[PDB]
Design a protein around this ligand. Structure first.
Ligand SMILES: Nc1nc2c(ncn2[C@@H]2O[C@H](COP(=O)(O)OP(=O)(O)OP(=O)(O)O)[C@@H](O)[C@H]2O)c(=O)[nH]1
Ligand SMILES: [Mg+2]
Ligand SMILES: [Mg+2]
Ligand SMILES: [Mg+2]
Ligand SMILES: [Mg+2]
Ligand SMILES: [Mg+2]
Ligand SMILES: [Mg+2]
Ligand SMILES: [Mg+2]
Ligand SMILES: [Mg+2]
Ligand SMILES: [Mg+2]
Ligand SMILES: [Mg+2]
Ligand SMILES: [Mg+2]
Ligand SMILES: [Mg+2]
Ligand SMILES: [Mg+2]
Ligand SMILES: [Mg+2]
Ligand SMILES: [Mg+2]
Ligand SMILES: [Mg+2]
Ligand SMILES: [Mg+2]
Ligand SMILES: [Mg+2]
Lengths: 191, 45, 97, 176, 199, 139, 117
RNA sequence: GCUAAACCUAGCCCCAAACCCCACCUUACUACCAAACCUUAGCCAAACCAUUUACAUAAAGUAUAGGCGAUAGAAAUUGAUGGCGCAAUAGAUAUAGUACCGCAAGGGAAAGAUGAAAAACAAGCAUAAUAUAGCAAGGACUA
RNA sequence: GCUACCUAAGAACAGCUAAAAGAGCACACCCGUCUAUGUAGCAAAAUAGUGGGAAGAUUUAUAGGUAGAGGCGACAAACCUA
RNA sequence: CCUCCGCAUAAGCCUGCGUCAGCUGACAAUUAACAGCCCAAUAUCUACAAUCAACCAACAAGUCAUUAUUACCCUCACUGUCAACCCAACACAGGCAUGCUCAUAAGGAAAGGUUAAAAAAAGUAAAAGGAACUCGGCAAAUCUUACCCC
């Protein structure tokens, strides 16, 4: 991506993203606090509570996470309305579009208390790394085929046919295929 | 009458301003070094 | 049109940040500490003008003398040229004599 | 046959073609050298078919059906190549102790830069090779000035980058 | 002689969801306990006998919001499928919609049902209109004289935080023609090209 | 194979063998009318016509009668926003004439929204008689 | 006058265009009369195996279990190939176990490598 | 009301600390054939020019040198945590040693600005050409 | 890569007259006497006509060479990238 | 109606009026026989031009050759192939080597429409005279003598 590329709601490679951020744009970079990867505590699917703005207090489910801008999109929450399909004649249709929310503007929700909770990345002997709520304890869990004609069966893919040997693939294949070569490689000079 | 002093010919171009000729003498090596220091994309012609 | 059409963002200055609050402390280190340390030793900056002052020509001469060997090639060339030019200016040009 | 350059006829025109997963390096490491040799050509035929599909899609100005399988095939071939290279490197280290398959040497070129010159195959010795003798692997004293200049340019770039990073960090601290 | 000077070339080679699509089962004006249960099991609190009052309140408040162009409240008061109908044609023109006492009590008609509720309420109320232009000159309806309005209003609901909002008004084919327009209109005939001839 | 140093051959030496071929080719529909026995391929630049013949005869068992090659120049005229020329890659085109009277022809490859469509159906375009008056109101 | 465009065989005069190539590896040599003699051994021979009966496929079912990558090392290969024989013979001249003092004499010399891929 | 106007950060400046796969010398980026080391000069000052003319502190601008003149100039001895910086004609030339210019060495640019989310007032003119006479204004005047 | 001169190995010179020509008339080609136009032009030296040479000390394509207190020069202080 | 040209090769440039859909993006294309890309050594050979090469004629003296031995079975790889094109800042009246076409079978369009003022450029015609113009017969028209200076 171009340096100081402004991450937006559209994915960084879509038609809309290319339209909004052509190669020549030089907009001012957006200042984002440096949340370390080991400190990020919002994940796709987490139930969260909005602290600020319209729909404050309401709890929804994170639909997307634009980590590069400290963003979490709560499905059907923090929504404005936009027209989709509006053509020269048709007015289009109104659609609720969510706006990104900052992790500072959003807090996780206890699995059962259904209330905002501050979280810590405390190690547990079983769950080596897992979130733990501070004000009321308890661990917030991390949320979340037919073989085709050109797909190997699992047993075939796992069959360990390898026999550790001191033979290169070339000579091993030569032996397997019966190719016979008697000529000796004449020595060459390297420099 | 004037203006068309450039009669292109790749043989002359390479034999006059080529990498081999620039390296042929210490002065041309310094020419290439100056271009590299300046960051020229085209070090030799 | 050389005038901005909006008020610039407000500039908040914390007059009581540690730097401003403790500014000047130990300026009297000498007279109040048996003169073990001269106040100029509190000066932090370029090695060639720590506790010393002079015009541009003197500053350039001191820089060349004290860190000339450690200067980059083109920076040192520029310093030598500047010293030469300043010598010429101060010794051959001016209203008075 | 040439039909192997095209997908199964039933898949022609399908908006989406269901595909498995690209071979992983760990999965490939369990296979024999013969098995990897055969899988290499299996994947090569699949890659040729997918590249043909991509080119024909470009020709017809239509989206390629399920382009992700091309990336899957490329990744699988890369993994197989990596596994073979790992085996070859281990065997070479055991039998000769050489970490590099191709001979080479650290040499100072005519420009004074230290490079890893990779040796080439010749029929005659180097002292007789005329063109090799024409090539120069030493830097005369006039190159030291330019070496210092390049070093100082690099130092300036590094200093600018570091100062910019520190200033950005200070700005971030002020903001938060 | 002095050679000519060329300027740089660049200077001269610069160049320049929470809705549904319509009605699941259209009610045709002159056995929904399954849908009533299908909404009760998901809502846990609801009263059909009390719904008509809330529906009328929402209707009147949404129209009052139209009066002031309170689109922020209209968004929560009507469905997204209805909002463009509510607000599109009325842009750049003031409306003086007002409500006066109803004629017969509003009552539910029928209800049907990732899952969206749906309630049809018949209202026979009395209302007033005065739609002006950008320039404040009346173009539809007297502001004082009220009219009797028979409407079949369909509400929809999202089934977690959604509420009951106007989804669509069903106009029966037998409904009386609406109020006549004030300004005369023209409907041009086929703009024939030279080769074409009128038929 | 490409991007690999070929073991130098001296007289009487062993045959040069490549086990894991690095070349990947494309079969491309000709842009012009071609004989029924001719197949057009896009090839890596480092592949010879002999290499292509052996490749097709071994991997695909295609009886090849003749091979011809030409290097197609890629346009270097398109310029980016910085006025820097964008180079379309040069490529290699191979015409392969099949043997045994075999014939080949390029196969004929390539032989929410519901809500949008239904709302478009239910547009209810304003009638001219309404004269721009919003028709939503029931009065 | 074009310094930036890559130098190819399409640019110079007849001699330049003939002399410069496209990276294709040589196959033979040129004799008197510009007659090209092609050496068969110089032509890469594609060692294509018999794919009949092969069970592997270009793709793998997603049902396959995930595993941890363990890049093969010289120590691991030695343990898995030589260590058993060494132990069995010690409990009871390294060429017996596989080690070769010199790569010379081998068709596939490991260093300097003299085989393709 | 048009052309347009503005903006804040991209970066830069000075310091401190710290020492930093393949191809390619043949026509470079082309797989493969029997020899380096050597005083700088000049501008310029002397009002020309010719000898001559600079490249820690203190001693000291002292001893000395010098068409003894312009000027040059020791030694003995002494001990030695950042920004009253710039903020897109500025700060690096830099968005870039790119575009472009030159055969080559080499020269060398310009510019961007919305939003939390886009998956929402210069000049010049026009409104509105013009009335006898005049450095175009001043005193004025109901005008 | 222009131009001055040179080196290697090439190419061109219709037709007529005279015969073996640094001959004559006159194409191609080279040059640029005079006139007019143009003079920010088609052109940073051109166009039209007219004119000199046009088998020779001729013209010319290709590669190479001589480099600045130097080169080269049938000396015009000419030319050596306007 | 014009034909300066034109078609190829060379050199040069490098996709630069092919298709599609909106100059821009995509897609396509130049297929070797033509041309380039050569030669195993060691010694040893070679006086007698070309000029239709025969008389003849010369001078400026000139472009073309092997042998004797020893080695030597793999044969058709690679690269150029497009264009309305290059050097002149330009769709520049200029420069641009060679072979054929010696006016063309090839290639092109001097007039955007109107009026027919001055001045200006080019061209045609002119009563009588025929250099009286002018620095000068410059230019134009004709097809013209004799003599000086260098
Ligand atoms: N004066 C000055 N101080 C600097 C500069 N760069 C860094 N510093 C100082 O370095 C100190 C340490 O910087 P930090 O970032 O806190 O720590 P750090 O990374 O261990 O520091 P470094 O070892 O200097 O790289 C601070 O007091 C900075 O102000 C510089 O350019 N100038
Ligand atoms: Mg020339
Ligand atoms: Mg070819
Ligand atoms: Mg002087
Ligand atoms: Mg700048
Ligand atoms: Mg104004
Ligand atoms: Mg003749
Ligand atoms: Mg003559
Ligand atoms: Mg001469
Ligand atoms: Mg003279
Ligand atoms: Mg003179
Ligand atoms: Mg000049
Ligand atoms: Mg015309
Ligand atoms: Mg006209
Ligand atoms: Mg007359
Ligand atoms: Mg007379
Ligand atoms: Mg007179
Ligand atoms: Mg007279
Ligand atoms: Mg005359």
């Amino acid at each position: 991506l171009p340096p100081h590329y402004r991450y937006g709601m559209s994915p960084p490679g879509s038609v809309a993203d290319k339209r909004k951020n052509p190669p020549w744009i030089r907009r001012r970079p957006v200042v984002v606090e440096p949340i370390s990867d080991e400190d990020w505590y919002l994940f796709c699917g987490d139930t969260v509570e909005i602290l600020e703005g319209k729909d404050a207090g309401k709890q929804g489910k994170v639909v997307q996470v634009i980590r590069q801008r400290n963003w979490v999109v709560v499905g059907g929450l923090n929504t404005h309305y936009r027209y989709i399909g509006k053509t020269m004649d048709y007015r289009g249709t109104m659609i609720p579009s969510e706006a990104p929310l900052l992790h500072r503007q959003v807090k996780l929700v206890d699995p059962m208390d259904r209330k905002p909770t501050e979280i810590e990345w405390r190690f547990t002997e079983a769950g080596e790394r897992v979130r733990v709520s501070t004000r009321s304890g308890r661990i917030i869990p991390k949320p979340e085929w037919i073989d085709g004609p050109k797909d190997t069966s699992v047993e075939d893919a796992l069959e360990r046919t390898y026999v550790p040997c001191l033979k290169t693939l070339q000579e091993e294949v030569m032996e397997a295929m019966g190719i016979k070569e008697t000529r000796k490689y004449k020595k060459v000079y390297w420099y | 009458a004037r203006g068309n002093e450039y009669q292109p010919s790749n043989i002359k171009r390479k034999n006059k301003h080529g990498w081999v000729r620039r390296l042929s003498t210490p002065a041309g090596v310094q020419v290439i070094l100056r271009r590299m220091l300046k960051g020229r994309k085209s070090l030799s012609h | 049109i050389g005038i901005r059409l909006t008020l610039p963002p407000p500039k908040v200055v914390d007059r009581w940040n540690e730097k401003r609050a403790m500014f000047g402390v130990y300026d009297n280190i000498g007279i109040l500490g048996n003169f073990e340390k001269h106040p100029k030793e509190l000066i932090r900056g370029p090695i060639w003008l720590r506790g010393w002052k002079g015009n541009e020509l003197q500053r350039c001469i001191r820089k060349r003398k004290m860190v000339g060997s450690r200067m980059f090639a083109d920076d040192l060339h520029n310093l030598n040229k500047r010293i030469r030019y300043l010598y010429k200016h101060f010794n051959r040009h001016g209203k008075f004599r | 046959g040439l039909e192997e350059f095209f997908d199964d006829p039933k898949n022609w025109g399908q908006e989406k073609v269901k595909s498995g997963a690209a071979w992983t390096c760990q999965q490939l490491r369990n296979k024999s050298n013969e098995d990897l040799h055969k899988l290499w050509y299996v994947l090569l035929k699949e890659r040729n078919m997918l590249l043909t599909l991509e080119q024909e899609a470009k020709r017809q100005r239509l989206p390629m059906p399920s382009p992700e399988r091309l990336d899957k095939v490329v990744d699988s071939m890369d993994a197989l190549d990596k596994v073979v290279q790992e085996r070859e490197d281990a065997l070479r280290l055991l039998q000769t102790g050489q970490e590099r398959a191709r001979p080479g040497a650290w040499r100072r070129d005519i420009f004074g830069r230290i490079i890893w010159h990779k040796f080439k195959q010749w029929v005659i010795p180097w002292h007789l090779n005329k063109r090799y003798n024409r090539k120069r692997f030493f830097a005369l004293p006039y190159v030291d000035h330019f070496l210092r200049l390049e070093r100082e340019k690099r130092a300036r770039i590094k200093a600018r980058k570091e100062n910019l990073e520190r200033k950005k960090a200070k700005i971030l601290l002020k903001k938060f | 002689f002095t050679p000519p000077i060329y300027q740089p070339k660049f200077k001269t080679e610069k160049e320049f969801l929470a809705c549904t699509a319509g009605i699941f089962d259209a009610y045709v004006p002159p056995a929904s306990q399954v849908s009533i249960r299908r909404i009760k099991d998901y809502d846990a609190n609801f009263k059909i006998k009390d719904f008509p009052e809330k529906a009328k309140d929402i209707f009147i408040e949404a129209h009052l919001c139209l009066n002031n162009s309170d689109h922020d409240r209209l968004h929560t008061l009507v469905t997204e499928h209805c909002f463009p109908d509510m607000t599109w044609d009325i842009k750049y023109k003031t409306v003086r919609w007002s409500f006066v006492e109803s004629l017969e009590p509003s009552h539910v008609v029928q209800v049907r049902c990732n899952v969206y509720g749906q309630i049809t309420v018949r209202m026979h109320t009395r209302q007033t209109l005065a739609i002006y232009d950008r320039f404040g000159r009346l173009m539809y309806g007297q502001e004082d004289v009220p009219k009797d309005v028979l409407e079949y209003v369909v509400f929809e609901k999202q089934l977690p935080y959604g509420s009951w909002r106007m989804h669509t008004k069903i106009v029966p084919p037998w409904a009386p023609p609406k109020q006549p327009i004030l300004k005369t209109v023209m409907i041009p005939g086929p703009q024939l090209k030279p080769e074409e001839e009128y038929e | 194979a490409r991007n690999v140093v070929y073991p130098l051959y001296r007289l009487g030496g062993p045959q040069l063998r490549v086990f894991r071929t690095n070349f990947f080719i494309q079969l491309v529909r000709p842009g012009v009318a071609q004989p029924e026995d001719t197949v057009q391929f896009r090839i890596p630049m480092e592949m010879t016509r002999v290499d292509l013949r052996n490749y097709l005869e071994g991997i695909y068992n295609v009886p090849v009668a003749a091979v011809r090659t030409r290097v197609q120049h890629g346009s270097n005229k398109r310029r980016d926003h910085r006025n820097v020329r964008i180079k379309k890659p040069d490529y290699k085109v191979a015409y392969v004439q099949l043997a045994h009277g075999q014939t080949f022809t390029f196969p004929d490859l390539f032989p929410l929204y519901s809500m949008l469509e239904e709302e478009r159906q239910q547009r209810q375009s304003s009638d001219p008689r309404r004269g721009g008056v919003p028709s939503w109101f029931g009065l | 006058a074009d310094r930036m465009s890559k130098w190819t065989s399409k640019r110079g005069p007849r001699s330049f265009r003939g002399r410069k190539g496209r990276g294709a590896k040589g196959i033979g040599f040129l004799t008197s009369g510009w007659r090209f003699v092609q050496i068969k051994e110089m032509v890469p021979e594609f060692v294509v195996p018999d794919l009949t009966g092969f069970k592997l496929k270009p793709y793998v079912s997603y049902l396959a279990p995930e595993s941890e990558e363990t890049p093969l090392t010289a120590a691991q290969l030695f343990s898995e190939a030589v260590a058993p024989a060494i132990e069995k013979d010690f409990k009871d001249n390294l060429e017996k176990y596989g080690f070769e003092p010199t790569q010379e004499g081998k068709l596939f010399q490991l260093y300097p490598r003299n085989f393709l891929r």
